[PDB]
Amino acid sequence: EVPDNPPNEIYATAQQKLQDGNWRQAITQLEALDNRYPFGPYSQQVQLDLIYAYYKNADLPLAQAAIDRFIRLNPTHPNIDYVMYMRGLTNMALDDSALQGFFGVDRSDRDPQHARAAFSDFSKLVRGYPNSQYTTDATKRLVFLKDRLAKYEYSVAEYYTERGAWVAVVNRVEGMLRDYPDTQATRDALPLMENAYRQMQMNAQAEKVAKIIAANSS
Amino acid sequence: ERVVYRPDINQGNYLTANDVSKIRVGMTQQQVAYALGTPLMSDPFGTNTWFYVFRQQPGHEGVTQQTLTLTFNSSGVLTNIDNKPAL
Amino acid sequence: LFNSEEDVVKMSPLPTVENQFTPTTAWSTSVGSGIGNFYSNLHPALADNVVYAADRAGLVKALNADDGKEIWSVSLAEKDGWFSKEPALLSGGVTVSGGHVYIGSEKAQVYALNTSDGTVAWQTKVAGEALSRPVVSDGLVLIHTSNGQLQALNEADGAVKWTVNLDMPSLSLRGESAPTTAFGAAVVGGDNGRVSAVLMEQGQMIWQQRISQATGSTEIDRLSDVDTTPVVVNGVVFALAYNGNLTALDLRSGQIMWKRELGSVNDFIVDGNRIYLVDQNDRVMALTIDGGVTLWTQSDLLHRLLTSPVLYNGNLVVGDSEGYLHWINVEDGRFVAQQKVDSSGFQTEPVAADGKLLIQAKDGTVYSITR
Amino acid sequence: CSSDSRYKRQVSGDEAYLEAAPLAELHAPAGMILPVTSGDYAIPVTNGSGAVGKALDIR
Amino acid sequence: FVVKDIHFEGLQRVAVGAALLSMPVRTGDTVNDEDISNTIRALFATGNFEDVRVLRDGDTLLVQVKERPTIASITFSGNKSVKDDMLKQNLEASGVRVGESLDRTTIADIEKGLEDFYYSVGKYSASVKAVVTPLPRNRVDLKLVFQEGVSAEIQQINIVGNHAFTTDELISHFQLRDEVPWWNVVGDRKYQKQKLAGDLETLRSYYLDRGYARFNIDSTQVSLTPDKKGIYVTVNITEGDQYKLSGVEVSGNLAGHSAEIEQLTKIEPGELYNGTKVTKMEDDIKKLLGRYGYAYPRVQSMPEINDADKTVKLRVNVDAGNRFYVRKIRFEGNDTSKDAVLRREMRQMEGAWLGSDLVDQGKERLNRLGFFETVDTDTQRVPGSPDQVDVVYKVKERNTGSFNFGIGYGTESGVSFQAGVQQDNWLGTGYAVGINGTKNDYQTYAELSVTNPYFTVDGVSLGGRLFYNDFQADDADLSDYTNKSYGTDVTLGFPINEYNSLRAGLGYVHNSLSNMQPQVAMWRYLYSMGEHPSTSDQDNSFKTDDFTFNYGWTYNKLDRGYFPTDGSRVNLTGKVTIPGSDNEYYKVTLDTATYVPIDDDHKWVVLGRTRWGYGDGLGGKEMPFYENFYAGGSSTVRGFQSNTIGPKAVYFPHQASNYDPDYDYECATQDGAKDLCKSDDAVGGNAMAVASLEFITPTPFISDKYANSVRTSFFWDMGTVWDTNWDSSQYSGYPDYSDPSNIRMSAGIALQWMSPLGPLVFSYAQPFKKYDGDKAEQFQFNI
């Protein structure tokens, strides 16, 4: 950190190490800048530049720590849309990260743990600030995590298909049904649960859903 | 294919014959659900068809099911006790 | 290096070693290992040239007090129960009242050994082991046991006359309350820092005076057994509460004349108005009886784990649980004589009786002392 | 560092989360339709201010 | 008066205007002298102004304040094994921390409560000295000096009120084997009041099972010994006349399973009372009803202790609840591995009633997985109907995969290297993938071992293992023992029991060799084959295409998948040849892994790992020499070198390896060492008996963050590898290995570092009983 110094030379060295990309040395400045001066005139911007130092150094719980600091330091601020962006943006990096993506192996169906948390913050962002510079960005992520939930919830419906729990197939399909309409995976879940009906010999209850397939052919 | 062993596939969510005699055509959904609760599958887009369907597979000896579906009206009043055996 | 780099506790030595009247021992007649390093209330009595000394191992002895020649000897090491062949394990000390040797044991038994031979004239199981010496008087065996029970046994047979509650400590806040008969009322100490007077005749509370408080948020002495037993000169009762808190208070009401709620004293005797004591730093002090006025004090003993202060050979005599003996001026702290006759440390009070100074150690048992 | 061939930290990273597009939704009538959204799925799709992706300020 | 202006003197965290609003004498407001006195307490009510002196210059106010705020640091000195943050937790209890108001008056408040903390430790012999050390503008370093004297130690237990049982049997509620005489110091018997309350309830369970149902600990009095260490006690109890179970009258909502409940309460009327068994017998019903559904099986016993016949009467009040509870289940802590990998390790199904014994069995496969850190769940009822209990399987998962390598032979030599890497749980799918091999000039070796462990719904372990050794031992020729060994091994693992699981396979052993080394034990096998290669020369070819039938069987009753602690897994691995194979032989092998708890808290656990093997011909021939057994170095026995345990062969008196290099790689060859040179590498025996005896111990110098995943373990190794068909005529001046008395020996400690690349095992071991050819590097580094 920084010893007891003038705050602006700490703040200059904070913004230098952000422009240097030395996020740790910006973290060295910005925290001790707010450790002695949380009453700083940029101490709100410090917490934003902390998240800028944290996320660009991929310090995801520390970015969320600077979020909850900024929640406590600025419970009202213009940049809470930034916070509701940097909440959902952090959890997206917090949910799934792997180098296997070029091989056709992806983590979009393993567990949407922080992806559901990123869904909440981003949907809060596009609800609490549908005017920000962050609500337009978050929407395609909210589009994305809906699919990441759709990839997740199809595979468990796929799991009980090889298991043979056909009540669980219909329930996990209805999990896709009752949560997001705008997914082809839910549309392919539409034959998947009527199979479960026919394995339960509910062919009549099945073919109602084939009409829904006939309805959702478009 | 020519095995005797197989780990069995099992599946609850059903009702008994005591639960069959617990209900009758005319019974409200709640009056079914007083001692039977809700099924773990119902009919979402149509009328209330309370699916209490037993399923099980015995290992390399056939298949079994008790499909007991309980259709209700819009008022949730019982219209059929539809017990169905295997296949 | 790290054979010796472990933890360490701090103490203080024994300054001012003097021998102005060159001391010695009167005799040794060792009972064996007595109390030992166990924390017990056992302590021998000396009378009639009969050293009434015992051990928790079992050997209760009568020793002829010029050499401690064996008058009688028995063994209270018991032989049966749910465990056979056990030692005596005496909790309460030696009380010889009449032809009995009344001793409360850690087997929750109060005995009475026929003083002619030491044969058990009676023994009675009491409610818990005896935290105090069995204060035997008036036909009663007045004990402060572990559970805060003032009991009375008919001292001829041990027939229980009552068993009534006292200041019950939150733990074994081990304080000898030792209920003595004081002017027709049994005046009892308190292990939670109280002090009480009850009726001698049936244990009917004259008053109980809350002086000091229990362990917890004013945490009290686990570096001493505070002499909570009220020593009763005329009806200003002088007593410690379990933080060492000396208190001059009325016999009949418990109303304070002065008290040392601030003061923390290990052991104490009232030599007239010169209350000779052992302070919490093992310091000797002479306090007044009309106040906490230090008449004199001394640090010739400091962290020297003293026994009770006693007057013998014209001097304030003090032994310790280091095994030293010290003779102090009756006045201002002049160390008179030092006798290192023990190394096992004295855990008993000095008995300045039979012309002697009878102290039984933990393991260096009876060392009777003269100068 | 890569002090041998000077080939530094290279090809990685993506923004496919922004590049994801929603899919076809249910066109089912009554008796074929059910409730379709339940949860935090409440998103005002706003081109209220854009500058999406890496061009957005994360400071 | 009225204030002209206020001098705001000394804030350190307060603002000037924030002091002005907290002043009731703010600028422009009427200021009486009482409002000045109102200000002092109100600026004392700020919690940050150590002094407040509200003064005025006639009317111009000036408030002399010394201030309380930010503590610069809190220095802990003497902050030993009783760690400083819990000491700081008392500072966090007393309101002080870095950044905060200090209030230097409250030092003794901290200096009491830290001792009261030290009181609760098991000490009281300690002193705490908080030192104020000033830093800029108010700031203070809190130097805290911990002169910790000593803790308390358990010495003696005195219990009165014992009716018929010994106090000493209650002293044994905590176990001791230690001593401190300055020459046998192995620990002590220190005090904690929760050891006592544990021993109190050990004493409670001590008499409940006896029958004592007037049993009550009357009171307890623990000593105030004048040392602050000596732990003596006076416990008052009443055992009270052991009672008998004279009848069970279980009642309530028995859910139609009352006879099954009666099976759990099949009791004897008049047997001595065991409330712990009764406590067990209630739990028998709660799992039976838990297997019958009924996740909330309220079962309430009532031992109507019948004091007249000195017995009890066991009323039990049962309330099962609802049968169907398992609506669905959830899974969490799963962001990398696929859900159906863990979901197939489950036995309770969604849309069902509860089998209580299914959810832990599924978790046991998850416990026996290995790439978990924790395995647990959240069995929450979804609120509403009594059909909605969603079991949220939140677990913690561990890294998968590990890389292995050799040593040396690179960048100052040819293109030559040793490789090998593992991807068990391949990319979150569960595929057990292990692939190794090495491309050198001596040899080109290929090996894959890939499994579909779960290929059907049975859990069929579809495991394929392919191999190709283009092994030449190419030093300057391949006529120093060419060996082209290749083929396949397809294996399947099957549930028979779910502990007892059988294995089977086929080996295609295509070994194409030329110009065999003249060691006799290799060539005795060739003579056992009926082949007569020319003794003094490495010139003779030998191709075999052996067709073997492999088999085996797994025992699996043992806790975890990567760090178990109790149980055993026994692993038979055997093989035999078939008619049509180029040699008729067999080879049986077995390894076991039993986990016997030394400590019943499993801080010390016996690890019984031993290997047995025997192989021979099916008639006329023997087992091939490359299938003979070995040990040494990287084996059960450490501190040796690899293949240094076993029989050692003798070369033939030899001339022509088709040119062994000059005075290099000798086989009693043309370049010297002739007339039956005894080889010193362990050519190994047709039988095996090796073992290592490992004992798990934790480390306190490293925190137990991964010291429960780091298996520090001592050993003493013993074992033999021996050829029970060793000749005594051919090997007469050469050691006879027909006996299993060739028991090698070593002793040392293993160092298993669980890296992000998995466990890394290092081992220094000292051999004490060795034999001929036992080459020994006392440290063994393994990956």
d(CA E506, CA E552) in angstroms, rounded, equals 11
Q: List phi, psi (to 5°) of E507.
A: -110, 125
d(CA B68, CA E196) in angstroms, rounded, equals 58
- The answer to whether the beta carbons of residues C294 and C275 sit under 8 Å apart is no
Q: Name C279's bridge partners.
A: C265
Residues E136 and E260 in one domain: no
**Helices A43-56 and A7-20 meet at what angle, rounded to 10?**
30
d(CA E65, CA E55) in angstroms, rounded, equals 10
- The answer to whether the beta carbons of residues E242 and E273 sit under 8 Å apart is yes
- The answer to whether the beta carbons of residues E244 and E271 sit under 8 Å apart is yes
Tell me the residue type at C362: K
Which residue in E has a C-alpha nearest to residue B5's C-alpha?
E496
What is the SS3 assignment for A100?
Answer: coil
Q: Does D10 touch chain A (CB under 8 A)?
A: no
- Under DSSP, the state recorded for E226 is T
Q: Hey, which residues 132-151 in chain A have their CB within 8 Å of chain D?
A: 132-137, 139-147
Dihedral through CA A7, CA A13, CA A19, CA A25, nearest 10?
Answer: -110
Closest residue to E335, CB basis, from A95, A163, A171 = A95
Which residue in C has a C-alpha nearest to residue E237's C-alpha?
C128
CB E458 to CB B6 under 8 A? yes
Residues E501 and E555 in one domain: yes
Helices and strands (H and E) in chain E: how many: 11, 41
The enclosing domain of B31 has a CATH number of 3.30.1450
- Under DSSP, the state recorded for C266 is E
Q: Does B41 touch chain E (CB under 8 A)?
A: yes
Q: Sign of torsion, CA E448 E453 E454 E459?
A: positive
Which residue in B has a C-alpha nearest to residue A163's C-alpha?
B9
**Helix/strand/coil (H/E/C) assignment for every residue in chain D:** CCCCCCCCCCCCCCCHHHHCCCCCCCCCCCCCCCCCCCCCCCCCCCCCCCCCHHHCCCC
| Residues of chain E positioned with their CB less than 8 A from the CB of A171 | 327-328, 350-351
Q: List phi, psi (to 5°) of A121.
A: -70, -40
Q: Is there a domain that residue B62 lies in? A: yes
- Under DSSP, the state recorded for C141 is E
Q: Hey, which residues 401-440 in chain E have their CB within 8 Å of chain A?
A: 427-428
Which residues form the domain of B79? 9-84
d(CA C107, CA C124) in angstroms, rounded, equals 10
d(CA E709, CA E701) in angstroms, rounded, equals 15
Write E436-443 long-range contacts (CB < 8 A, 24+): E436/E404, E438/E406, E439/E415, E440/E409, E440/E414, E440/E416, E441/E414, E441/E416, E441/E474, E442/E471, E442/E472, E442/E473, E442/E474, E442/E475, E443/E469, E443/E470, E443/E471, E443/E472, E443/E473, E443/E474
Our CA-based measurement puts residue A182 at a distance from the nearest CA of chain B, in whole angstroms, of 18
d(CA E121, CA E190) in angstroms, rounded, equals 11
Question: What is the distance of C-alpha A87 from the center of its chain?
Answer: 8
d(CA B69, CA A197) in angstroms, rounded, equals 12
Indicate the pairing of strand E150-151 with strand E123-125.
Answer: antiparallel
Chains that touch A (3 or more CB pairs under 8 A): B, D, E
- The answer to whether the beta carbons of residues A90 and A64 sit under 8 Å apart is yes
d(CA C211, CA C217) in angstroms, rounded, equals 15
d(CA E250, CA E261) in angstroms, rounded, equals 8
Closest residue to B11, CB basis, from E328, E351, E384 = E351
Residues E262 and E296 in one domain: yes
What is the SS3 assignment for E708?
Answer: coil
d(CA E763, CA A186) in angstroms, rounded, equals 55
Please state the domain count of chain E. Answer: 6
d(CA E215, CA E234) in angstroms, rounded, equals 17
What is the SS3 assignment for E344?
Answer: coil
Classify residue E393 as exposed, middle or buried by CB count within 10 Å of its CB (0-12, 13-18, 19+): buried
| Residues of chain E positioned with their CB less than 8 A from the CB of A110 | 334-339, 428
Please state the domain count of chain C. Answer: 1
- The answer to whether the beta carbons of residues E727 and E653 sit under 8 Å apart is no
Which residues form the domain of C121? 1-371
Q: What is the number of alpha carbons within 13 Å of residue E192 lying toward its C-beta?
A: 7
Host H or E run for residue C123: strand C119-125
Closest residue by Cα to residue E348 from E374, E333, E323, E329:
E329
Tell me the residue type at D16: A
Q: Does A211 touch chain B (CB under 8 A)?
A: no
CB B44 to CB A202 under 8 A? no
Angle at C255 between CA C252 and CA C258, to 5 degrees: 130
Q: What is the largest CA-CA distance in chain D?
A: 69
Q: Is there a domain that residue E375 lies in? A: yes
CB C82 to CB E162 under 8 A? yes
Q: Which residues of E484-499 are buried (b: 16+ CB within 10 A; e: fewer)?
A: bbbbebebbbbbeeee
Q: Which residues of A171-192 are buried (b: 16+ CB within 10 A; e: fewer)?
A: bbbbbbbbbbbbbbbbbebbeb
Please state the domain count of chain B. Answer: 1
Host H or E run for residue E194: helix E193-208
d(CA E334, CA A95) in angstroms, rounded, equals 10
| Residues of chain A positioned with their CB less than 8 A from the CB of B11 | 164-167
Question: At how many Å resolution was this determined?
Answer: 9.8
Host H or E run for residue E722: strand E712-722
Which residue in A has a C-alpha nearest to residue B13's C-alpha?
A167
Residues E681 and E593 in one domain: yes
Q: Which two tokens stand for residue A113?
A: 């743990």
| Residues of chain A positioned with their CB less than 8 A from the CB of E338 | 109-110, 155
d(CA E130, CA E90) in angstroms, rounded, equals 12
- The answer to whether the beta carbons of residues C198 and C206 sit under 8 Å apart is yes
d(CA A124, CA A134) in angstroms, rounded, equals 11
First to last CA, chain A: 60
d(CA E373, CA E391) in angstroms, rounded, equals 19
CB A187 to CB D39 under 8 A? no
Which residue in A has a C-alpha nearest to residue B44's C-alpha?
A174
First to last CA, chain D: 27
Closest residue to A215, CB basis, from D23, D28, D46 = D28
What is the SS3 assignment for A165?
Answer: coil
- The answer to whether the beta carbons of residues E360 and A174 sit under 8 Å apart is no
What is the SS3 assignment for E594?
Answer: strand
Q: What is the number of alpha carbons within 13 Å of residue A214 lying toward its C-beta?
A: 8
Total number of residues shown for chain C: 371
Chains that touch E (3 or more CB pairs under 8 A): A, B, C
Indicate the pairing of strand C256-260 with strand C245-250.
Answer: antiparallel
Q: Name C235's bridge partners.
A: none
d(CA B56, CA B47) in angstroms, rounded, equals 27
Question: What is the distance of C-alpha A183 from the center of its chain?
Answer: 18
CB D31 to CB B44 under 8 A? no
> Edge-to-edge strands of the sheet including C149-154?
C135-137, C140-144, C149-154, C159-165
Residues E603 and E496 in one domain: yes
Q: Does D27 touch chain A (CB under 8 A)?
A: yes
Q: Is there a domain that residue E420 lies in? A: no
Residue whose token pair is 């023990």: C342
* Mutation target among E224, E231, E236, E237 for the C interface, most CBs of C within 10 A: E224
Q: Does B44 touch chain D (CB under 8 A)?
A: yes
Which residues form the domain of E183? 152-238
Closest residue to B65, CB basis, from A177, A201, A212 = A201
The yes-or-no reply on E/A contact (3 CB pairs or more, < 8 Å) is yes
The enclosing domain of E373 has a CATH number of 3.10.20.310
Residue whose token pair is 């293109």: E415
Q: Name E437's bridge partners.
A: E419, E446
Under 8 Å CB-to-CB from E598, ≥6 apart: which residues? E604, E605, E606, E695
